[PDB]
């Protein structure tokens, strides 16, 4: 974006030219600078700005393509006053200056805020912890200097989000005094001082003076260019049974097929059952199903879509098998080539499932008997790297393909002819090792035999359907070995065979030493370049071993292609302890498989794998929830999410929690939901960025008494906490549906008229928008006194409605609100005097018309927000007529001024008693149709107030119930306000932000552990701000590495309050290739991650009964492997085992595998906001280990 | 002076204008102050 101070330089140079001087001798004054639209400089091309000066009027103008950009007054400073730039009298001399922000810390804070300033705009050499005094670097440009002054202004503020200059009241510049104010640092760089004074609203730096700076929230670009791919790391046994037994749709499909088969031997909405029905209508025995036999070949192209046939592919089994294939690949590049692609259609699936791998180079070709088929979807092939080729199973593989890594057939649907020839040709073609992925049906199960019957063609071999032992023996003939099998309920299977590679006797290295002495041994073994004996690591004793990460990190390292691991980690303490010995048969088979990863958990032989996590947002039953716009400006994203009111069981008499039967929608809510209004324009440091919907409700108090109240926000919910001073007692005659409409509209009407306009009987007043709630309340109040009322409406039906509701009105008391014609009406019917009170919720051109209607001694009440927000001019000449221009904002009561509110409360109550306060009309929607209500109000045809029925009303006056009915709202993480939370290494770059997240989510008692304590300005600023907010932060030096340290840390947390959460973010990095590593390096790297987490586990099992969160952060190096981080991998992989073993028992546990963190591999850094949102997602899942990274490009 | 004095107004402030020049010249008045509850009074005792 073009800097706001950039326009200043342009206009300044224009004036200098017009005066015949230069910038270096033209002290200048700006006044009433208004920035209208932000200009977005393009990547290529240029943008043209023209500056026109009205010298006589001392006004300028900046325009772009005929559109106004900036406007204001610029004139020379005739007689500069050097003392104007003196640093204003300060409240504190600030002598100590103990800690301060350096450039890196200040711009890290700014970047977290949203600003992405680069080098040329980085000028704040250092700043105070409050952003009130600083030291600004001086290059020879003014744009950067003034932009840095504005950056200093922004830095110290407490608000969040992106704020940009919109209005400035006065700027004074004096280059001579500026050059007199600069000075040289100990280096050769020039520098100037800056002071920000919020009390006086002035920023002074050198020969510049910014006063009256106004900044307004800017909508986020909603680009969300980062979409992290999220996976779950779960154990996966090599052999599985009943793969799809969980599903019932496939069960119903098979039931229908079984019924059709019984009909044959004793809906047609899916391919296989429809073909079965086609057989049924005819006689299978008669004519040898000649007609159907001809029709049998017709359906084969559409046959694979059958959900029964393609169930295994859709299941995670295919992903697991492909992941196993890629893991054993010696390098990051793989070669795979289909066979019989014209029927298997695996080209669609395999490339997609392998995409999440960040560093996978894939070569794919679809090989078919006849090109006439694969040409059918050639276009659908081009977008992917899938190549083209002609090949037959019986024929030998052309040397073009030759050594192949992976071979996918899907013969379950494709016709493989003779299995012997196909297997022979393939296994010969396959590279030594490699993999042969085959998907075929089986005999000995209903679907297989049914299809076999249906087939009338030899080449399919009944679709090549044999018994499981038949396939196993055939594999035996071709010398392959099975390293994968996945049976399915409906009989389909998924084999994965690996052509063996001859190997010498492996070298076994136990890895159970506690001192990491084996690191020397493994290094020595791997040193030898000329050798191929594969090392087989053993991790038998410690189930908290992390050899998986060690292996992954070492595969990429030199000579790492000869590394295999065997770990025996059983979560259940009562499982069989395997005998892994050179003579043991179990070791014989596991070594025969020639598979890198071999973990034996709870009686099985599998390997950890990755799987894409379900995208659905977790949902839970919950009494307390609120309406949230998960994406601003998209009413279709409305939904119900959990609320912090679930906590706060004890409550002081000052507040009391109330159920919400009917919640109203006011116009502010529509503006917020549509995005036309920011979430920070409302007073009160809400900080949620959402949940600011709803201002009034009608429900029942805790005691069961009926009530209606007004709240600053969060009224659209199933519960609402507020002080009793903002509640009224709905009378017996009315109904809660009616009571929802009274509060806000009548309170604002009374406060505007009686308390501000001090209206009296016999007065004439103009009330705009008569049909609206405020209009109707004002009309009802006015006529009760006995006033004469003019109203403006937008249609004839609204005139009819107002006439029906208010009989006292007459045809002469209505005007038009869509034009400025009402001015003439009011002036004519009033005799030209005008009106006394005016209530104006209207826009610019119409607001001026209202001012012309005021009579002498009139009073203009402004309840709108557009002209006031944009700072439009108001001619003072109207005041020569005795006139009071009021500005009414009812929301000012919630923040402060509680003494005045009781007056409005009493006025409203008196009106309700007397009968003046009569409920408006209500168009009631339901709890599940909140979006419908929002859209209906957006249309604007509503007369009366839209309402939402959260719950129905019982007949009785009092019920003294316990809790409302339970609904289903998106689950989100909130924490009690009476529990403590521990963040090991909480002063690091990540951990301060995790605390900030926790503090925003309710945490009041926090403990941060760090070896060196507070040591930087950023940490001091953060801790001071949190303590000022009222949080009992407490920094401890307890090192969780030793058990004494863990016990002490938990003791401190308990003394502060019961321990609820434990987050371990401690990290010490000692990077290096295996050749340069040492045992002590591994010890140091594993102290905080592996020993600390074990000690936390022990201490929490001993003395933490109310704990609900146990989170430990890992890295993708453990999962995807990384070269030169072996110690990091071993430390992290060992953490995951503890978390997994905690959940099998029942205790909380969760380990996150992050990618790269940006704000504080082949994957881009992930911004902090996305990280925290994804983290909020992960704390609700039922899983153990989870991952999050953003793929490159 | 008048524009400087407006900015001194606090929340729920009240401005009394017993002057006449700025009113007679119909000089502009920024309406952004009314976002703070503020009443602008034009006091003319000649009207009684
Ligand atoms: N700070 C304060 O003191 C408070 C401020 N207010 C403001 O005062 C006003 C009171 O109105 P409110 O109670 O919200 O009533 P509504 O928003 O329900 O109605 C607003 C009025 O504006 C017109 N209108 C409504 N919807 C549309 C639309 N979609 N398109 C065009 N015109 C429309 C109608 O008049 P017409 O028939 O002429 O179309 C209608 O009577 C609002 O501007 C509100 O923001 C309200 C209370 C507190
Ligand atoms: N790119 C990234 O940042 C990624 C990070 N992660 C995860 O995030 C975390 C990194 O934390 P982050 O703050 O960013 O890293 P930093 O290195 O910036 O901070 C680490 C913190 O841990 C503290 N610490 C280390 N060992 C101990 C110990 N024995 N006792 C007490 N405190 C200790 C350090 O104390 P001191 O200040 O004295 O040094 C420091 O405060 C790890 O859990 C890691 O797995 C993983 C993936 C991506």
From Swiss-Prot, chain B:
Compartments where located: Cytoplasm; Melanosome
Highest taxon of source: Eukaryota
Post-translational modification: In adipocytes, S-nitrosylation of Fatty acid synthase occurs under physiological conditions and gradually increases during adipogenesis.
Residues with the N6-acetyllysine modification: 20
Organ and tissue specificity: Ubiquitous. Prominent expression in brain, lung, liver and mammary gland.
Biological role: Fatty acid synthetase is a multifunctional enzyme that catalyzes the de novo biosynthesis of long-chain saturated fatty acids starting from acetyl-CoA and malonyl-CoA in the presence of NADPH. This multifunctional protein contains 7 catalytic activities and a site for the binding of the prosthetic group 4'-phosphopantetheine of the acyl carrier protein ([ACP]) domain.
Miscellaneous field: The relatively low beta-ketoacyl synthase activity may be attributable to the low 4'-phosphopantetheine content of the protein.
Subunit structure: Homodimer which is arranged in a head to tail fashion. Interacts with CEACAM1; this interaction is insulin and phosphorylation-dependent; reduces fatty-acid synthase activity.
Name this protein carries in UniProt: Fatty acid synthase
The organism of origin for this protein: Homo sapiens (Human)
């Amino acid at each position: 974006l073009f800097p706001a101070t950039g326009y200043l330089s342009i206009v300044w140079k224009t004036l200098a030219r017009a005066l015949g001087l230069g910038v270096e001798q033209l002290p200048v004054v700006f006044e009433d600078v208004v920035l209208h639209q932000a200009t977005i400089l393009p990547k290529t091309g240029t943008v043209s700005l023209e500056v026109r000066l009205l010298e006589a009027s001392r006004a300028f103008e900046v325009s772009e393509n005929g559109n106004l950009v900036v406007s204001g007054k610029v004139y020379q400073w005739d007689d500069p006053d050097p003392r104007l730039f003196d640093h204003p009298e300060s409240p504190t001399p600030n002598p100590t200056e103990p800690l301060f922000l350096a450039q890196a810390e200040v711009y890290k804070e700014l970047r977290l805020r949203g600003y992405d300033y680069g080098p040329h705009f980085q000028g704040i050499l250092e700043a105070s912890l409050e952003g009130d005094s600083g030291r600004l670097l001086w290059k020879d440009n003014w744009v950067s200097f003034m932009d840095t002054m504005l950056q200093m202004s922004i830095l110290g503020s407490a608000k969040h989000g992106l704020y940009l200059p919109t209005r400035v009241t006065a700027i004074h510049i004096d280059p001579a005094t500026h050059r007199q104010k600069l000075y040289t640092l100990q280096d050769k760089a020039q520098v100037a001082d800056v002071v920000v004074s919020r009390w006086l609203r002035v920023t002074v730096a050198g020969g510049v003076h910014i006063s009256g700076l106004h900044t307004e929230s800017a909508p986020r670009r909603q680009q969300e260019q980062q979409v992290p791919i999220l996976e779950k790391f779960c154990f996966t046994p090599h052999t599985e049974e009943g793969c799809l037994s969980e599903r019932a749709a496939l069960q119903e499909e098979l039931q229908l097929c079984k019924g059709l088969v019984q009909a044959l031997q004793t809906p047609s909405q899916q391919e296989l059952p429809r073909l079965l029905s086609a057989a049924c209508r005819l006689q299978l025995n008669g004519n040898l199903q000649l007609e159907l036999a001809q029709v049998l070949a017709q359906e084969r192209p559409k046959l694979p879509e059958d959900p029964l046939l393609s169930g295994l592919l859709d299941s995670p089994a295919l992903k697991a098998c492909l992941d196993t294939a890629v893991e054993n690949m010696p390098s990051l590049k793989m070669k795979v080539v289909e066979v019989l692609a014209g029927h298997g259609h695996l080209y669609s699936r395999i490339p997609g499932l392998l995409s999440p791998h960040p560093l996978l180079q894939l070569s794919y070709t679809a090989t078919d008997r006849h090109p006439q088929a694969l040409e059918a979807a050639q276009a659908e092939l081009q977008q992917h790297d899938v190549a083209q080729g002609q090949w037959d199973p019986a024929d030998p593989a052309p040397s073009a393909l030759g050594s192949a890594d992976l071979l996918v057939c899907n013969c379950a649907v494709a016709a493989l002819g003779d299995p012997a020839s196909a297997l022979s040709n393939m296994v010969a073609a396959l590279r030594e090792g490699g993999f042969l992925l085959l998907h075929t049906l089986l005999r000995g199960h209903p679907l297989g035999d049914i299809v076999a019957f249906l087939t009338s063609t030899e080449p399919q071999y009944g679709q090549g359907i044999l018994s499981q032992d038949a396939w196993e023996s055939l594999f035996s003939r071709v010398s392959l070995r099975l390293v994968g099998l996945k049976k399915s309920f409906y009989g389909s299977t998924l084999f994965l065979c690996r052509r063996p590679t001859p190997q010498d006797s492996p070298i076994f290295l136990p890895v159970d030493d506690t001192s990491f002495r084996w690191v020397e041994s493994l290094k020595g073994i791997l040193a030898d370049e000329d050798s191929s004996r594969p090392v087989w690591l053993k991790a038998i004793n410690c189930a908290t071993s992390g050899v998986v990460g060690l292996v992954n990190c070492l595969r990429r390292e030199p000579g790492g292609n000869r590394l295999r691991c065997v770990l025996l980690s059983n979560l259940s303490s009562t499982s069989h302890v395997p005998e892994v010995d050179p003579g043991s048969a179990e070791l014989q088979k596991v070594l025969q498989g020639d598979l890198v990863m071999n973990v034996y958990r709870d009686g099985a032989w599998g390997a950890f794998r990755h799987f894409l996590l379900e995208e659905d947002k977790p949902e839970e039953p919950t009494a307390h929830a609120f309406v949230s716009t998960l994406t601003r400006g998209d009413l279709s994203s409305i939904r119900w999410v959990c609320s912090s009111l679930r906590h706060a069981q004890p409550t002081c008499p000052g507040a009391q929690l109330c159920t919400v039967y009917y919640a109203s929608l006011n116009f502010r809510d529509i503006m917020l939901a549509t995005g036309k209004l920011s979430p920070d324009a409302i007073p009160g440091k809400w900080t949620s960025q959402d949940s600011l919907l709803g201002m009034e409700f009608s429900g029942r108090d805790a005691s069961g008494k009926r009530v209606m109240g007004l709240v600053p926000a969060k009224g659209l919910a199933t519960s609402v906490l507020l002080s009793p001073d903002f509640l009224w007692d709905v009378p017996s005659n009315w109904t809660l549906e009616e009571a929802a409409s009274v509060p806000v509209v009548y309170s604002t009407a009374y406060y505007a008229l009686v308390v501000r306009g001090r209206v009296r009987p016999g007065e004439t007043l103009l009330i705009h928008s008569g049909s609206g709630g405020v209009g109707q309340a004002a009309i009802a109040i006015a006529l009760s006194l006995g006033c004469r009322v003019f109203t403006t409406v937008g249609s004839a039906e609204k005139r009819a409605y107002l006439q029906a509701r208010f009989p006292q009105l007459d045809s002469t008391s209505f005007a038009n609100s869509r034009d400025t014609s009402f001015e003439q009406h009011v002036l004519w019917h009033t005799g030209g005097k005008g009106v006394d009170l005016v209530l104006n919720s209207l826009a610019e051109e119409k607001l001026q018309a209202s001012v012309r209607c005021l009579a002498t001694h009139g009073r203009f009440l402004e309840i709108g927000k557009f002209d006031l927000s944009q700072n439009h001019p108001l001619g003072m000449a109207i005041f020569l007529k005795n006139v009071t221009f009021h500005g009414v904002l009812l929301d000012a009561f919630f923040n402060e001024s509680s003494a005045d509110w009781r007056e409005v409360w009493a006025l409203v109550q008196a009106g309700i008693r007397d009968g003046v306060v009569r409920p408006l009309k209500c168009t009631v929607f339901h709890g599940a149709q909140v979006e419908d209500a929002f859209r209906y109000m957006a249309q604007g045809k509503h007369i009366g107030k839209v309402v939402v029925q959260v719950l129905a009303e019982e007949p009785e006056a009092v019920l003294k119930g316990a809790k409302p009915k339970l609904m289903s709202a998106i689950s989100k993480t909130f924490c009690p306000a009476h529990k403590s939370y521990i963040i090991a290494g909480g002063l690091g770059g990540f951990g301060l932000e995790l605390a900030q997240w926790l503090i925003q989510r309710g945490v009041q008692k926090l403990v941060l552990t760090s070896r060196s304590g507070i040591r930087t300005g950023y940490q001091a600023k953060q801790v001071r701000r949190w303590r000022r907010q009222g949080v009992q932060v407490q920094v401890s030096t307890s090192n969780i590495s030793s058990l004494e340290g863990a016990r002490g840390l938990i003791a401190e947390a308990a003394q502060l309050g019961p321990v609820g959460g434990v987050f371990n973010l401690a990290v010490v990095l000692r990077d290096g290739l295996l050749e340069n590593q040492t045992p002590e390096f591994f010890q140091d790297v594993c102290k905080p991650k592996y020993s600390g987490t074990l000690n936390l586990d022990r201490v929490t099992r001993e003395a933490c009964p109310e704990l609900d969160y146990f989170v430990v952060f890992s890295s993708v190096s453990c999962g995807r492997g990384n070269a030169g981080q072996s110690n990091y991998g071993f430390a992290n992989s060992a953490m995951e085992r503890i978390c997994e073993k905690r959940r099998h028992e029942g205790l909380p546990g969760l380990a996150v595998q992050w990618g790269a963190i940006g704000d504080v591999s082949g994957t881009l850094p992930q911004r902090m906001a996305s990280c925290l949102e994804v983290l909020d997602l992960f704390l609700n899942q039922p899983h153990m280990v989870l991952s999050s990274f953003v793929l490159a490009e």
